[PDB]
Amino acid sequence: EIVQLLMEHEQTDITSRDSRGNNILHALVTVAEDFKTQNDFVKRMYDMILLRSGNWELETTRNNDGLTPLQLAAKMGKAEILKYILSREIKEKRLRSLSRKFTDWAYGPVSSSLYDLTNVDTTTDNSVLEITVYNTN
Amino acid sequence: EIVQLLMEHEQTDITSRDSRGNNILHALVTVAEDFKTQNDFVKRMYDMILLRSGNWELETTRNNDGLTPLQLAAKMGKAEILKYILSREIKEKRLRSLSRKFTDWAYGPVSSSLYDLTNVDTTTDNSVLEITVYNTNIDNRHEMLTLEPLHTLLHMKWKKFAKHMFFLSFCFYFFYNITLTLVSYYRGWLQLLGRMFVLIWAMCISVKEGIAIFLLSDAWFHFVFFIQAVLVILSVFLYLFAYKEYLACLVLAMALGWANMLYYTRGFQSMGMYSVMIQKVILHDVLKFLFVYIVFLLGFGVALASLIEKCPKDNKDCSSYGSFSDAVLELFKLTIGLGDLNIQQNSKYPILFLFLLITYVILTFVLLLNMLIALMGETVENVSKESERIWRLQRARTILEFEKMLPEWLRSRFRMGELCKVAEDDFRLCLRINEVKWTEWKTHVSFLNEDPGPV
Amino acid sequence: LVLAMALGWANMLYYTRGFQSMGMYSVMIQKVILHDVLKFLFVYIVFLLGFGVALASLIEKCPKDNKDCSSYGSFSDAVLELFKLTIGLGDLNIQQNSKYPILFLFLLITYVILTFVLLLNMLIALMGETVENVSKES
Numbered sequence: 001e002i003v004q005l006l007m008e009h010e011q012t013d014i015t016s017r018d019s020r021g022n023n024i025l026h027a028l029v030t031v032a033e034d035f036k037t038q039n040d041f042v043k044r045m046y047d048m049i050l051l052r053s054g055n056w057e058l059e060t061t062r063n064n065d066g067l068t069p070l071q072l073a074a075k076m077g078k079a080e081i082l083k084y085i086l087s088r089e090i091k092e093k094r095l096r097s098l099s100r101k102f103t104d105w106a107y108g109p110v111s112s113s114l115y116d117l118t119n120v121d122t123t124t125d126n127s128v129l130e131i132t133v134y135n136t137n
Numbered sequence: 138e139i140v141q142l143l144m145e146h147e148q149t150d151i152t153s154r155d156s157r158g159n160n161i162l163h164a165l166v167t168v169a170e171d172f173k174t175q176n177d178f179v180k181r182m183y184d185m186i187l188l189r190s191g192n193w194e195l196e197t198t199r200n201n202d203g204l205t206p207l208q209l210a211a212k213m214g215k216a217e218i219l220k221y222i223l224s225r226e227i228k229e230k231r232l233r234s235l236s237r238k239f240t241d242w243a244y245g246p247v248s249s250s251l252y253d254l255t256n257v258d259t260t261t262d263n264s265v266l267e268i269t270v271y272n273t274n275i276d277n278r279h280e281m282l283t284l285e286p287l288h289t290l291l292h293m294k295w296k297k298f299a300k301h302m303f304f305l306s307f308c309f310y311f312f313y314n315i316t317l318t319l320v321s322y323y324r325g326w327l328q329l330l331g332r333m334f335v336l337i338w339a340m341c342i343s344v345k346e347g348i349a350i351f352l353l354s355d356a357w358f359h360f361v362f363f364i365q366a367v368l369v370i371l372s373v374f375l376y377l378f379a380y381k382e383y384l385a386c387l388v389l390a391m392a393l394g395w396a397n398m399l400y401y402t403r404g405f406q407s408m409g410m411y412s413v414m415i416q417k418v419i420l421h422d423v424l425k426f427l428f429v430y431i432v433f434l435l436g437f438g439v440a441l442a443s444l445i446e447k448c449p450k451d452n453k454d455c456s457s458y459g460s461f462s463d464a465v466l467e468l469f470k471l472t473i474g475l476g477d478l479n480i481q482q483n484s485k486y487p488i489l490f491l492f493l494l495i496t497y498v499i500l501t502f503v504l505l506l507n508m509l510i511a512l513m514g515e516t517v518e519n520v521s522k523e524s525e526r527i528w529r530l531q532r533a534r535t536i537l538e539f540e541k542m543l544p545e546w547l548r549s550r551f552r553m554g555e556l557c558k559v560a561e562d563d564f565r566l567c568l569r570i571n572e573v574k575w576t577e578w579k580t581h582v583s584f585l586n587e588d589p590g591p592v
Numbered sequence: 593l594v595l596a597m598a599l600g601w602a603n604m605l606y607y608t609r610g611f612q613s614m615g616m617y618s619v620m621i622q623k624v625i626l627h628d629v630l631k632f633l634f635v636y637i638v639f640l641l642g643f644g645v646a647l648a649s650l651i652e653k654c655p656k657d658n659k660d661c662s663s664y665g666s667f668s669d670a671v672l673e674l675f676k677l678t679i680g681l682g683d684l685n686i687q688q689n690s691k692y693p694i695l696f697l698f699l700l701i702t703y704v705i706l707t708f709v710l711l712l713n714m715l716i717a718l719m720g721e722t723v724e725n726v727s728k729e730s
Binding site: 318 | 627631635638639641642643645646648649650652667677680681682683684691692695699701702704706709710712713714716717719720723
């Protein structure tokens with residue numbers, strides 16, 4: 001409710017980066033240590049916030065470490081949140097641009113779940129695949 | 138309801154002590170055998186009673202055995218009640234003076250649960266820690282120590298000093314037994330000083346283990362160290378004298394010491410469970426096998442010897458298994474797999490000889506198989522759980538041994554207790570802990586320190 | 593050249609990691625040789641050195657101008673005999689050129705027994721880790 005209030009307030013700054021360089025979503029990604037401890041409320045908040053901000057600006061940012069919150073999800077052990085971020089399907093035609101998980105082919109129980117490889121394809125200076133696989137701890 | 142009535146009556150005597158010296162709370166502590174059997178109603182009664190009596194008088198009492206109900210819980214196996222006795226938080230500002238579990242720092246899911254160490258800090262003639270750890274006839278000591286304050290005390294002390302002392306003693310003993318090896322292998326001025334150091338260190342450990350025995354199988358090591366040092370001093374005595382037995386006792390003590398090295402291997406976590414496995418194996422599993430193997434050995438040995446009793450024909454080499462000891466030696470050699478298997482000479486019944494031998498082999502093999510099957514059955518469960526618990530117990534016992542070895546002033550400097558103020562001019566010693574809970578969101582109305590931060 | 597050759601034939605296991613079954617097999621090899629065995633080898637070796645110096649000291653009696661008359665003469669030779677016995681090839685007999693033959697035999701037997709129970713316990717620890725960690729972690 002308070003999040004709804006703040007994002008309804010005009011003086012709010014959504015894209016504000018902290019002294020550590022992190023943004024809102026970066027914090028949440030630091031926060032979700034495990035599914036059992038929090039009963040998975042954070043994914044709901046991530047979803048609500050992205051639905052309340054229809055831009056790619058947030059996911060496009062980099063912290064002072066030079067990493068996307070997705071890249072930060074890799075640098076940490078965030079798993080369920082990552083399952084949500086990669087598997088993201090939106091029926092809303094206004095915000096459908098955001099959903100990475102597409103479904104373009106379906107005759108019945110069979111379907112084509114089409115996914116997005118932008119920063120994952122091992123192309124631009126790092127990748128979720130490379131980052132994770134070469135990560136430690 | 139009846140309790141409410143009685144405590145509402147003025148003629149009641151709450152502090153009344155029995156012919157045994159116990160009071161109300163002592164009795165409940167005697168009766169809390171298990172959570173499952175009683176469905177945990179006693180904790181509720183303890184709580185209601187303390188809330189009906191706003192004084193420290195009861196828990197400050199001592200029985201005729203000279204023990205608080207808390208100390209009585211330690212001498213007993215009461216666990217669930219004890220978690221309440223230590224972890225006690227009261228939001229009521231009138232009775233808040235009683236609660237030992239304080240929470241002075243909270244910004245969110247993070248908080249500081251501050252606990253009280255009054256009788257637990259190993260200070261006043263006994264303590265819950267010392268009492269529990271040195272207690273016997275209680276198998277619940279593990280769950281007792283899994284609690285927050287005691288566990289964190291042990292860890293804080295290990296990170297303070299004890300690890301240094303453990304590695305230190307390990308180094309001393311290492312150099313000691315190594316010097317002993319050099320001596321035993323080579324038998325100027327350096328050797329004399331080394332021998333003097335050996336005598337001194339041996340006297341030290343010998344007197345330590347002697348005092349330990351006087352204060353007296355988890356303690357199996359003490360007697361072993363004692364026997365070692367005894368054999369050492371005996372070797373020294375016989376060395377000076379014109380005797381041939383000095384080498385024997387010396388060597389025996391040396392090998393015994395290299396065996397005692399396992400006790401120092403008990404330090405490491407994995408090696409700890411490993412050594413616990415050693416002790417458990419050699420205690421439970423093997424002894425049956427060895428006893429019964431030995432009686433089999435004696436039987437088949439006398440059998441073979443009797444058959445072999447045929448005349449050697451003036452040649453010892455012609456007669457194998459002639460001496461009973463030689464026959465037993467051949468059998469054990471065979472069980473190893475070096476034995477000499479052959480059609481016997483100077484024998485009346487070679488067939489029966491062979492058959493009895495084969496039967497001994499087969500029986501030994503299946504017997505080995507059965508110590509193995511018993512081993513696996515016990516291990517599948519006892520291996521993981523019992524190892525960690527018993528290991529931590531041993532760790533705690535040794536830690537407290539080191540802590541009791543030290544004087545008061547050094548102890549006073551190494552105290553993990555940090556004093557903290559509490560309402561009503563109540564000053565008490567405490568151990569700060571910081572924990573987190575992500576599930577239950579409960580606003581903190583009761584907190585001592587206004588400014589939420591480590592300062 | 594030879595040592596590198598044998599080291600390479602050992603490195604062949606790394607290529608065995610390709611196959612699914614042999615993959616989990618090689619993972620089991622690595623996990624075993626890392627966790628289980630090192631404890632056994634360290635503690636075995638210290639036992640070995642102790643009982644070795646023991647046997648050598650007892651054997652320190654004069655060989656009588658005959659090296660063959662003195663077994664366990666060199667510490668390395670004694671340790672060799674002990675490991676040979678653990679294999680099961682050792683020569684067990686009443687020792688000559690010895691002051692305390694009974695003590696010698698007893699120390700030897702104790703070494704055997706300790707080694708055996710020790711082996712049994714590493715096997716215990718192995719199984720205890722294998723019940724769960726074998727399948728999934730592999």
